[PDB]
Design a protein that fits this description.
The structure holds 3 chains of a larger assembly.
Chain A: H1 14-37, H2 44-69, H3 80-108, H4 111-114, H5 119-122, H6 125-148, H7 162-165, H8 171-200, H9 207-210, H10 212-236, H11 244-266, H12 270-277, E1 288-289
Chain B: E1 4-5, E2 14-17, E3 21-24, E4 33-37, E5 47-57, E6 71-80, H1 94-102, E7 108-111, E8 122-124, E9 136-138, E10 141-146, E11 158-161, E12 164-167, E13 178-179, E14 193-197, E15 202-203, E16 209-217, E17 223-236, E18 246-253, E19 261-263, E20 266-269, E21 283-285, E22 312-324, E23 337-340, E24 343-346
Chain C: E1 2-6, E2 9-11, E3 18-24, E4 31-38, E5 44-51, E6 56-58, E7 68-72, E8 77-81, E9 91-94, E10 97-99, E11 113-117, E12 124-127, E13 131-132, E14 139-145, E15 153-158, E16 165-169, E17 173-174, E18 185-187, E19 190-195, E20 205-210, E21 217-218, E22 224-225
Parallel strand pairs in C: 2-11, 13-22
Antiparallel strand pairs in C: 1-3, 3-8, 4-5, 4-9, 4-10, 5-6, 7-8, 9-11, 12-14, 14-19, 15-16, 15-20, 16-17, 18-19, 20-21
Classes of the chains: A mainly alpha, B mainly beta, C mainly beta.
The structure holds the ligand Cc1nn(-c2cccc3cc(Cc4cccc(C(F)(F)F)c4)sc23)c(CO)c1C(=O)NCCO.
The site of ligand EN6 has 23 residues of chain A, from helix 2, helix 7 and helix 11.
PDB class: membrane protein/immune system
Keywords: Complex, membrane protein, beta-arrestin1, membrane protein/immune system, MEMBRANE PROTEIN-IMMUNE SYSTEM complex
Entry title: Cryo-EM structure of the orphan GPR52 beta-arrestin 1 complex bound to ligand c17
């Protein structure tokens, strides 16, 4: 395929990534519209979590669909430097907040299995709002060194010129991002879901438990599509291997994770399943009394 | 005495019913009863079917969709009427016998039965901006004439009247609702004891709450304010365990208590709908068409019942929350608070 | 368990008076305090009512925009401001309490205050207008309603001077506190109660009420005398 052709003719994998962006924005639009046109607040604790995760991934879809237009819409090749920097920063922050928000879903809806006797006391609306503000501040502060000039945060923003041919990652940066964003995420998911799976065994179990059959599915596919990103971040930045096409495929899988996730979430829970299994197929008088004879 | 009549818009399908408002006990269900009178000359071969659908409406108050309709029904029982069930001899009631005696042998009766583990007829508050079908669970009884269940129900020949299922008070109450939670702060290991009590457990609607608080502030801190508020816990259970925490009436009093001092005086609260007009998501007990009603009667269930199957469950718990001060060697006015739960079943009596 | 009445006097036309009634033992958030006017030598007529649980305020044709009625839950008191009094407002005002949930007639009343002035709509019809009967005479008084109400009517036995009391509601059940001899029945739009054993104490004027629609109003009025 064509190489160094951003200014020469055109690029063909733009179609693949625009398909990924279209899928991501479609799934996130349908999840947001389901949760906003039919306000149900189901599992109120997890409700704001999953709604903000849908928001964050919709933003990641829009901001990584921006290149699909503004890569060949105009005379590209003038001021992409700060554009690439801010775009890589914003997409990486959005993906970090999506992942940490899923981890916080797992750690919050775990107390509904072990400690439900005072569950409505630890988690409130103000506490969860503070937790979301803290999660966004944490993602911004952990990815601030990316814009500070210490390196680029993964292969999210290699679609441009400088940050594909000139920018290089730092081992001191990939170690940081693994150590305080991904390794704690694995720790939280392990230490929560192992305890959960120790209790899914029956005593021989509620709507609070029947959500596990879909949340375990969600996190399992999320880690299946997240596996070939941490290894590649720890590999190429440590100067052991570097494959253009493999990096493209891995990054595409790791961004399409947030396209496949809302689709299978809506395909899991029955508030949207009733909206598909039933939707796929396609004046009165006055209540007057009478007279009944008594005994 | 009196029997309700609805009649079809065409003027053919007329359904009678004994009592629009139906009671429900812990382990006994009041059965619905009614008769259907229709001209057999019109019904050449069509069969009249009468059903009870316990609708759950959750999607706004706007128009429906092409195929979504944002609805689900937790219990749909259909009973044949034409012919008058020759296969099974239903236990004909005194009301049914009297109704069939008032008219001729033309009418054919029907009878349903409701499992106890079903939600009381409560409709959530539509809100001021919404104008349409309301949220919440709403019972329904409809009779239609057709040849099969899968066939379309002809609305121009369809009759529909709304019933409501409402629970009535337990005559014998429990001892009292009491709860006492203390809290020890990091500054000093001298926790303060808080005690709360109510007059009874079952309250007729509109009766005054009589909360009796008792605090012994032994810590080296001051209680800035005391907040008392009955909070409507509307446990919506569709496929989840979503919970709501809407307050109903909050009364405050700046009756501060000095450190190493006690304080005990009763407060009076009254839950009512006049000042809760704008609180969206509130639970109201029953709606026929639009008539204003009381707050949601507390749906009591039998002890040990499966509390994870029902449609909407509302319960009332009063919070005795008081805010403390973080004054000290290095501290600001902002601080935390300690609150105690207290449940009580505010719901109607029986005439 | 009882409601007092106060604020009587004589007011010239164009004046105002904030006549108020106070009740003890009746929760204001469980009882909708009413307000009625009995014209001098004529029939009683409902004028205003406030249901504090709902925060509503209903009026009548001669009352809407004329006077103001309010109540406070702190003092368990209802204050009726009789602003812009006219010639037609000359009446005695009785403060009456009804169960604010599932209206069951007017249970408790007040002593009443006399107000005088100096320098759609439905109407129940009661027959006979006057009657004289002795002890043991079977007497039936018919209250014929122009528009058919939903079997929700009440009868009141108002002796001279004293405030009327409640005996029947929905024409079926007698209020707890009355002798079991009293009865009642419904026949279409015609409502009839039976008085046969006419005791000396029971000889008093009777009145029919229909609590079905807004602008709730009494009938025409009947009297019981000795033949
Ligand atoms: C155009 C182009 N692509 N590429 C790549 C070649 C091989 C791998 C990758 C991986 C990328 C990261 C990514 C992958 C998928 C979705 C996204 C997203 F940001 F859209 F979400 C980002 S870009 C890219 C280059 C390299 O230089 C260029 C270019 O600038 N000139 C072509 C030189 O041959």
């Amino acid at each position: 395929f064509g190489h160094y052709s951003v200014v020469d003719v055109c690029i063909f994998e733009t179609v693949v990534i625009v398909l990924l962006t279209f899928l991501i924005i479609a799934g996130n639009l349908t999840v947001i519209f389901v949760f906003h046109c039919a306000p149900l607040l189901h599992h109120y604790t997890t409700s704001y979590f999953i709604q903000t995760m849908a928001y964050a991934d919709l933003f990641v879809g829009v901001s990584c669909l921006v290149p699909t237009l503004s890569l060949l819409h105009y005379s590209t090749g003038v001021h992409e430097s700060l554009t690439c920097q801010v775009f890589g920063y914003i997409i990486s922050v959005l993906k970090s907040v999506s992942m940490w928000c899923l981890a916080c879903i797992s750690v919050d809806r775990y107390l509904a299995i072990t400690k439900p006797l005072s569950y409505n006391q630890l988690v409130t609306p103000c506490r969860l709002r503070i937790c979301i503000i803290l999660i966004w501040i944490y993602s911004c502060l952990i990815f601030l060194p990316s814009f500070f000039g210490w390196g680029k945060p993964g292969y999210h923003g290699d679609i441009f010129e400088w940050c594909a041919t000139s920018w290089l990652t730092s081992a001191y940066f990939t170690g940081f991002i693994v150590c305080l964003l991904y390794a704690p995420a694995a720790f939280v998911v392990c230490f929560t879901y192992f305890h959960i799976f120790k209790i899914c065994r029956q005593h021989t179990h509620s709507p609070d438990r029947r959500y596990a059959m879909v949340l375990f599915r969600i996190t399992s596919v999320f880690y299946m599509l997240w596996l070939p990103y941490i290894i590649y971040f720890l590999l190429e930045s440590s100067r052991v291997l570097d494959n253009p096409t493999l990096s493209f495929l891995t990054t595409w899988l790791a961004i399409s994770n947030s396209f496949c996730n809302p689709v299978i979430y809506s395909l899991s829970n029955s508030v949207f399943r009733l909206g598909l299994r039933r939707l796929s197929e396609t004046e009165s008088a006055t209540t007057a009394s009478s007279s009944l004879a008594k005994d | 005495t009196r029997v309700f009549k609805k009649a079809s818009p065409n003027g053919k399908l007329t359904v009678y019913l004994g009592k629009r408002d139906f009671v429900d006990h812990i382990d006994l269900v009041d059965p619905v009863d009614g008769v259907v009178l229709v001209d057999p000359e019109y019904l050449k071969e069509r069969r009249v079917y009468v059903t009870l659908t316990v609708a759950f409406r959750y999607g706004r108050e706007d128009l429906d969709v092409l195929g979504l309709t944002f609805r689900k029904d937790l219990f749909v029982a259909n009973v044949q009427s034409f012919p008058p069930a020759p296969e099974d001899k239903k236990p004909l009631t005194r009301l049914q016998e009297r109704l069939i005696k008032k008219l001729g042998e033309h009418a054919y009766p029907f009878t349903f039965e409701i499992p106890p583990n079903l939600p009381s007829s409560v409709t959530l508050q539509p809100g001021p901006e919404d104008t349409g079908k309301a949220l919440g669970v709403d019972y329904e009884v409809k009779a239609f004439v057709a040849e099969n269940l899968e066939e379309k129900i002809h609305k121009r020949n369809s009759v529909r009247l709304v019933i409501r299922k409402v629970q009535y008070a337990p005559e014998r109450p429990g001892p009292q609702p009491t709860a006492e939670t203390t809290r020890q702060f990091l500054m000093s290991d001298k926790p303060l004891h808080l005690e709360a009590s109510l007059d009874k457990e079952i309250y007729y609607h509109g009766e005054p709450i009589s909360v009796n608080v008792h605090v012994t502030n032994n810590t080296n801190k001051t209680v800035k304010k005391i907040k008392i508020s009955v909070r409507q816990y509307a446990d919506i259970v569709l496929f989840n365990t979503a919970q709501y925490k809407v307050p109903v009436a909050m009364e405050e009093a700046d009756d501060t208590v000095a450190p190493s001092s006690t304080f005990s005086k009763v407060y009076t609260l009254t839950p009512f709908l006049a000042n809760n007009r704008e609180k969206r998501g509130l639970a109201l007990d029953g709606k026929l068409k639009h008539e204003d009603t009381n707050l949601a009667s507390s749906t009591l269930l039998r002890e040990g019942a499966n509390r994870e199957i029902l449609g909407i469950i509302v319960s009332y718990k009063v919070k005795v929350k008081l805010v403390v001060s973080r004054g000290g060697l290095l501290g600001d006015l902002a601080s935390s608070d300690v609150a105690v739960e207290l449940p009580f079943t505010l719901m109607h009596p029986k005439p | 368990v009882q409601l007092v009445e106060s604020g009587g006097g004589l007011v010239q036309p164009g004046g105002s008076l904030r006549l108020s009634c106070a009740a003890s033992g009746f929760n204001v958030y469980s009882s909708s305090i009413h307000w009625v006017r009995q014209a001098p030598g004529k029939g009683l007529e409902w004028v205003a009512s406030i249901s504090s649980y709902y925060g509503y305020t209903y009026y009548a044709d001669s009352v809407k925009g004329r006077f103001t009625i309010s109540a406070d839950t702190s003092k368990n008191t209802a204050y009726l401001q009789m602003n812009s009094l006219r010639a037609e407002d000359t009446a005695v005002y009785y403060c009456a309490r009804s169960r604010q949930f599932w209206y069951s007639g007017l249970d408790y009343w007040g002593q009443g205050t006399l107000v005088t002035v100096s320098s759609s709509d439905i109407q129940m019809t009661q027959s006979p207008s006057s009657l004289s009967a002795s002890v043991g005479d079977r007497v039936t008084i018919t209250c014929r309603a122009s528009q058919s109400v939903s079997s929700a009517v009440a009868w009141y036995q108002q002796k001279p001077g004293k405030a009327p009391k409640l005996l029947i509601y929905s024409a079926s059940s007698l209020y707890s506190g009355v002798p079991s001899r009293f009865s009642g029945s419904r026949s279409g739009t015609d409502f009839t109660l039976t008085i046969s054993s006419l005791q000396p104490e029971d000889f008093a004027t009777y009145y029919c009420q229909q609590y079905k629609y807004v602008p709730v109003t009494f009938g025409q009025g009947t009297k019981v005398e000795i033949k």
